[PDB]
Ligand SMILES: [Cl-]
């Protein structure tokens with residue numbers, strides 16, 4: 001109920017905004033490109049007084065990720081931390097008023113078609129997000145999962161003041177270690193969970209993301225967990241054992257990853273709440 | 289006015305907040321140590337979409353700074369830019385509801401006695417600011433100006449994510465190049481204008497700051513100008529010619545200074561609006 005406009009955007013992100021604003025000007029959906037990004041006051045407040053206590057965090061381990069499927073489990077709204085690994089960690093849960101699973105799935109099919117669409121989601125941070133197999137993405141003979149999974153997206157976007165080039169490979173929840181029986185019993189409507197690698201060495205996973213969406217009568221909740229870095233539990237993913245060295249040889253030490261944890265938390269909060277504010281209207285107008 | 293809570297504080301600043309929160313716990317003025325920092329929505333929006341047009345900016349030249357003293361001049365609320373120099377530039381104007389000039393002068397004399405007091409002003413960013421002559425601040429044979437001017441303050445505080453150690457030398461407005469007649473005619477109630485240098489290079493001025501306050505029936509306006517960098521017009525200040533080289537040799541290129549210009553704008557907006565939110569209450573209880 002109490003939303004509040006985000007008030008800070010790094011200098012490079014302000015410049016990106018101006019670039020994106022020029023680019024989207026003559027698009028059919030330009031009216032959806034908006035400068036005010038509102039977030040829940042409660043949620044933003046929770047990430048202004050330091051990292052979470054380690055005891056309340058999760059690792060990418062099988063035990064930890066499956067905690068998300070417990071019937072009595074409901075995620076906190078926000079929070080970030082640095083884990084031994086070293087690894088950045090983010091937890092969140094966003095509400096999408098009036099949004100359905102089908103609309104949310106539509107979004108992931110629709111936006112990659114044009115970079116300018118990707119910029120509606122986060123005007124200040126997003127550059128481009130083309131997938132490798134765009135024909136597969138639009139193939140109606142395939143289920144959502146067959147269209148999206150194993151179809152590397154190459155996201156270029158700022159996280160804080162760092163321009164990143166992330167290769168995002170959406171994956172079946174079960175291949176990520178989520179228990180199928182529990183997942184079914186949790187009645188989850190969809191997943192955009194993925195492995196992520198840096199463009200620098202695309203074959204080395206540096207990240208697991210879990211994103212589970214589930215309808216309520218008044219809309220939809222997205223529960224998300226981000227892990228970016230190195231961790232022994234990541235070894236179940238091919239190439240991941242090389243993460244620690246890759247990270248070190250790039251700039252990613254403990255301090256840099258703790259920073260990234262907070263910046264990811266801000267990014268996640270801004271983009272998903274902003275998407276929630278227009279997605280149902282956008283879908284109605286451009287579902288076509 | 290439409291005030292809104294500032295939503296972002298850099299990681300190192302969040303950590304400092306906690307240390308500051310613990311240090312202030314047992315102080316009689318602890319109730320004035322507050323996490324929420326509200327700013328004008330109108331002001332903050334003006335610094336979210338890039339730098340100002342150079343045409344609207346000022347240099348620290350004698351001719352330029354005196355424009356601040358023209359009969360019907362009123363500063364815009366906010367704005368930042370990088371000037372040729374290279375030089376970071378910030379303009380602002382803040383309103384202090386129900387605040388008098390005496391209250392504002394008292395703040396400058398009272399807070400430097402204890403670090404904990406300095407933290408009230410900006411809980412997330414301020415570490416300490418002892419001056420060279422602390423006893424001078426309480427000497428009753430001395431005017432506000434006599435207590436402050438030529439009394440070097442060694443401010444340690446975050447600007448953005450950068451911990452800075454700044455030697456602040458408040459000076460008589462005339463000596464910074466402002467016109468006595470214009471000044472008198474403008475009926476300014478006070479100035480906390482200063483030259484600033486880096487603590488590890490105390491004899492090279494890298495900043496001019498102008499801060500002019502004037503009372504009105506409903507409170508007080510504070511007009512502020514920050515210049516941080518190198519510029520030919522700074523040459524009138526002893527040692528200022530060495531700033532270009534000094535900046536080049538430390539971290540400060542064009543990119544760093546343009547960033548610093550935005551982070552200064554944010555810092556200025558937060559601390560001064562926040563001060564405005566409690567100063568009169570603080571004064572009623574602790575003032576003299
Ligand atoms: Cl493990």
Ligand code: NI
Pocket residue numbers: 060061062063233
């Ligand atoms: Ni495990």
Ligand SMILES: [Zn+2]
Pocket residue numbers: 122125126157267271
């Ligand atoms: Zn994003």
Ligand SMILES: [Zn+2]
Pocket residue numbers: 410413414445555559
């Ligand atoms: Zn300050």
